[PDB]
Every structure is written in structure tokens, then in C-alpha cells.
């Protein structure tokens, strides 16, 4: 209706055994960097921060689940193409690798809109978009991310 | 006889569970059993009794899926907040826009599972109710199943405690 918006969850997971993202997040001195890595990767290959927003980051078994909010059906389409083509993943492997001070951090991604696993629907972009729209964003950005944004910003000053 | 006694016993039950200060604690007993009924698909979800933000405030209830719903089906405990049609909705401000904090209480009172969220008022989940219940909103990935099913503090004596806190700022 009035403005096309939708949401989905992006599952991010490591391949090497140590590079466990769950613990890396709960780590007081890594969390900010991981946050920064996810934010930079999305803005690089997923879409601008005003068109692709992170609402929450779930530490959930040993992957990281990022709740996303998409603004505009067209921009969402750009995200989906970047996702299926591997561009999103390429940028995330680079940013996280730099974030955790490692040579490589190969990733395994998953994308879900409600119970629908979009990975099995990548060939039909219209179906993916329809599934994302079906998931109405119901929460504003989680306070934790604003807290990390403050931290990221205070650090870069000195 | 029944549409008789049955209804009266239900009212009393609802009355006994209701709170009017935006704070609700939901004790779910017989956890083990309810847990398996969920895992088996027989009874996927459970509604909690209703509670309110004030004596004549919003009417709300919680909806939980022991084996998950949506993106968390089969992997997480899913917990939701539901705005219900209240007897005094004509006097309230719509859409519903109060921060809601959902919690699974650690019975050693050390590390509670907590998710505080501010409603995105554009969602139909927060508009004035037309039906008994609006579409639920909440946490599909509230708590990974491993935390509440072997080895730890959330389940104790076959029971768990869910807590909800509706921030009354502005009311």
C-alpha cells in the first residue's frame, strides 16, 4: 500500500572452527567491530542505510541472525540480486575477516521471510519480494544497535 | 447447564489472572507435556489470560509457541504480544504505541532472556482492533530451544515463568 516495506532474517555463519560468530558477538571487545562489519557489508552490496535497515542482531546458535527492514520494492530487488549473485556474501566475508583480524572468514548465508526460506526461491524474484512484503515490520530499531552506533562513533573520534 | 457453569468458571479464571498495571507474569506449568504437544504439531501455540495497561486501558495477552513459529519454527521458542479488542478502546489512543518488554525468567535470577521492542506503528498489529485479537507481533526467535530443554535454569519443577512489561510512558 502507501509505501512498500518488508522484512526478512539474514542468517550468517562461519566455516572455520574458531571463527564462531555467536561468541564473537557476545565478546565485549569484538561486538562493536562485528556490528560495524555487518553494517558496512550491507551498505556496500545490499543497499544504502535508508533503504536497507538492520532492526536487530540475534545471537542464536552459533550463527548471527540479522533482522532486516527493506524500504522500496525496487531496492529490495537489488538486495535479492546481490544476495543470489554472491555479492552480499563477498562483502561480508571481507568485512568480517577484517573485523576479527583474520585472513579469511568464509561464510554460509540463509535468507528467510517468516517460515519461507527464500534460498529455495531465488530463481523467482517476484515470489521472494511477495514473501518479504508479507512480513510487515513490527518493531523499530533495537536499542542495542543504537548503543553500538554510539560506541562506533565515539571510538572513531580519538 | 454448561454454556452455563463453564462460562462462569472461565470468567473467574480470567479475573484471577488479570493485572491492570502493564505487568504480567505467566506461569506455564506441565512444561514437559506442553512442550511435546508443540513438537508433535498437536498444540503448536498457547494464549495467556488477558491483562491491561491500566484499570480501563488496553487489553493484551501473550501467545507462545514452545517449538517456534515463523522464522523460528522448530528451532526457537517464539513469544508474541497481542493487542485485543478492549471494552474501553473508544477512549484510548490508537495506534498502540507503548514499548513492550518480553522475558523468560531465569529461576536462579541470574540471566533472563529479554527482548524490549518499540512497535513500528505502521503495522496492522497496532491499529484499533476490529476483531477480538489483532495480528500478533513479537519475537519469532525469542529463545533458541537449547536454553529451555535440558541442562539449565529456565525450566524448574516442570514449569517456566514468562514476564511482560508494558511501558506506560505517555499514558
Curated annotation (Swiss-Prot), chain A:
What stretch of residues is annotated with the motif Nuclear export signal? 140-156
Report the subcellular localization: Nucleus; Cytoplasm; Cytoplasm, Cytoskeleton
Task: For this entry, list what GO says about its biological process.
Answer: apoptotic process; canonical NF-kappaB signal transduction; cellular response to tumor necrosis factor; extrinsic apoptotic signaling pathway; extrinsic apoptotic signaling pathway via death domain receptors; positive regulation of apoptotic process; positive regulation of canonical NF-kappaB signal transduction; positive regulation of cell migration
Q: Name the principal localization, coarsely classed.
A: nucleus
Q: Does the keyword Endoplasmic reticulum apply?
A: no
Q: Name one GO molecular function term.
A: identical protein binding
Tissue distribution is: Found in all examined tissues.
**Record's Gene Ontology CC terms?**
cytoplasm; cytoplasmic side of plasma membrane; cytoskeleton; cytosol; death-inducing signaling complex; nucleus; plasma membrane; receptor complex
Task: Determine if Nucleus is one of this entry's keywords.
Answer: yes
| Keywords recorded for this protein, A-Z | Apoptosis, Cytoplasm, Cytoskeleton, Glycoprotein, Nucleus
Function text: Adapter molecule for TNFRSF1A/TNFR1 that specifically associates with the cytoplasmic domain of activated TNFRSF1A/TNFR1 mediating its interaction with FADD. Overexpression of TRADD leads to two major TNF-induced responses, apoptosis and activation of NF-kappa-B. The nuclear form acts as a tumor suppressor by preventing ubiquitination and degradation of isoform p19ARF/ARF of CDKN2A by TRIP12: acts by interacting with TRIP12, leading to disrupt interaction between TRIP12 and isoform p19ARF/ARF of CDKN2A.
Q: Domains: what does the record tell us?
A: Requires the intact death domain to associate with TNFRSF1A/TNFR1.
What interactions and quaternary structure are annotated? Answer: Stimulation of TNF-alpha receptor TNFRSF1A leads to the formation of two distinct signaling complexes. Plasma membrane-bound complex I is composed of TNFRSF1A, TRADD, RIPK1, TRAF2 and BIRC2/c-IAP1 or BIRC3 which interacts with CHUCK/IKK-alpha, IKBKB/IKK-beta and IKBKG/IKK-gamma promoting cell survival. Subsequently, TRADD, RIPK1 and TRAF2 dissociate from TNFRSF1A and form cytoplasmic complex II with FADD and caspase CASP8 promoting cell apoptosis. Within complex I, interacts with TNFRSF1A/TNFR1, TRAF2 and kinase RIPK1.
Output this protein's name: Tumor necrosis factor receptor type 1-associated DEATH domain protein
Curated annotation (Swiss-Prot), chain B:
Query: What subcellular locations does the record give?
Result: Cytoplasm
Domain MATH positions: 21-166
PTM statement from Swiss-Prot or TrEMBL: Phosphorylated at several serine residues within the first 128 amino acid residues.
* Domain of life of the organism encoding this protein: Eukaryota
Main function:
E3 ubiquitin-protein ligase that regulates activation of NF-kappa-B and JNK and plays a central role in the regulation of cell survival and apoptosis. Catalyzes 'Lys-63'-linked ubiquitination of target proteins, such as BIRC3, IKBKE, MLST8, RIPK1 and TICAM1. Is an essential constituent of several E3 ubiquitin-protein ligase complexes, where it promotes the ubiquitination of target proteins by bringing them into contact with other E3 ubiquitin ligases.
Assembly and partners are described as: Homotrimer. Heterotrimer with TRAF1. Heterotrimer with TRAF3 (via TRAF domain). The domain containing the RING-type and the first TRAF-type zinc finger can also form homodimers (in vitro). Interacts with TNFRSF1B/TNFR2. Interacts with TNFRSF5/CD40. Interacts with TNFRSF4, TNFRSF7/CD27, TNFRSF8/CD30, TNFRSF9/CD137, TNFRSF11A/RANK, TNFRSF13B/TACI, TNFRSF14, TNFRSF16/NGFR, TNFRSF17/BCMA, TNFRSF18/AITR, TNFRSF19/TROY, TNFRSF19L/RELT and EDAR. Stimulation of TNF-alpha receptor TNFRSF1A leads to the formation of two distinct signaling complexes.
Of which family is this protein a member? Belongs to the TNF receptor-associated factor family. A subfamily.
Q: What is known of its domains?
A: The coiled coil domain mediates homo- and hetero-oligomerization.
Q: What is this protein called?
A: TNF receptor-associated factor 2
> Which gene underlies this protein?
TRAF2
User: Span of the full-length protein shown?
Assistant: 331 to 501 of 501
Amino acid at each position: 500500500h502507501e509505501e512498500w516495506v518488508g522484512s526478512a532474517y539474514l542468517f550468517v555463519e562461519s566455516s572455520l572452527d574458531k571463527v564462531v560468530l555467536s561468541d564473537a558477538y557476545a565478546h565485549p571487545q569484538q561486538k562493536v567491530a562485528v556490528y560495524r562489519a555487518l553494517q558496512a557489508a550491507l551498505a556496500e552490496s545490499g543497499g544504502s542505510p535508508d533503504v536497507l535497515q538492520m532492526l536487530k542482531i540475534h545471537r542464536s546458535d552459533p550463527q548471527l541472525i540479522v533482522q532486516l527492514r527493506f524500504c522500496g520494492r525496487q531496492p529490495c530487488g537489488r538486495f535479492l540480486r546481490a544476495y543470489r549473485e554472491g555479492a552480499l556474501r563477498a562483502a561480508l566475508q571481507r568485512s568480517l575477516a577484517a573485523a576479527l583480524a583474520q585472513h579469511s572468514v568464509p561464510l554460509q548465508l540463509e535468507l528467510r521471510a517468516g517460515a519461507e526460506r527464500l534460498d529455495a526461491l531465488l530463481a523467482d524474484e517476484e515470489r521472494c519480494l511477495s514473501c518479504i512484503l508479507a512480513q510487515q515490520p513490527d518493531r523499530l530499531r533495537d536499542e542495542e544497535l543504537a548503543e553500538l552506533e554510539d560506541a562506533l562513533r565515539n571510538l572513531k573520534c580519538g | 447447564k454448561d454454556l452455563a457453569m463453564a462460562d462462569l468458571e472461565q470468567k473467574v479464571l480470567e479475573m484471577e489472572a488479570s493485572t491492570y498495571d502493564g505487568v504480567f507474569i505467566w506461569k506455564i506449568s506441565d512444561f514437559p507435556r506442553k512442550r511435546q504437544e508443540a513438537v508433535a504439531g498437536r498444540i503448536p501455540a498457547i494464549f495467556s489470560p488477558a491483562f491491561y495497561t491500566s484499570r480501563y486501558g488496553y487489553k493484551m495477552c501473550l501467545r507462545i509457541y514452545l517449538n517456534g513459529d515463523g522464522t523460528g519454527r522448530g528451532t526457537h521458542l517464539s513469544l508474541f504480544f497481542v493487542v485485543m479488542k478492549g471494552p474501553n478502546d473508544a477512549l484510548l489512543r490508537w495506534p498502540f504505541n507503548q514499548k513492550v518488554t518480553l522475558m523468560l525468567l531465569d529461576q536462579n535470577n541470574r540471566e533472563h532472556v529479554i527482548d524490549a521492542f518499540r512497535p513500528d506503528v505502521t503495522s496492522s498489529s497496532f491499529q484499533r482492533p476490529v476483531n477480538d485479537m489483532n495480528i500478533a507481533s513479537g519475537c519469532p526467535l525469542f529463545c533458541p530451544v537449547s536454553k529451555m530443554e535440558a541442562k539449565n535454569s529456565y525450566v524448574r519443577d516442570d514449569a517456566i515463568f514468562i514476564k511482560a512489561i508494558v511501558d506506560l510512558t505517555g499514558l
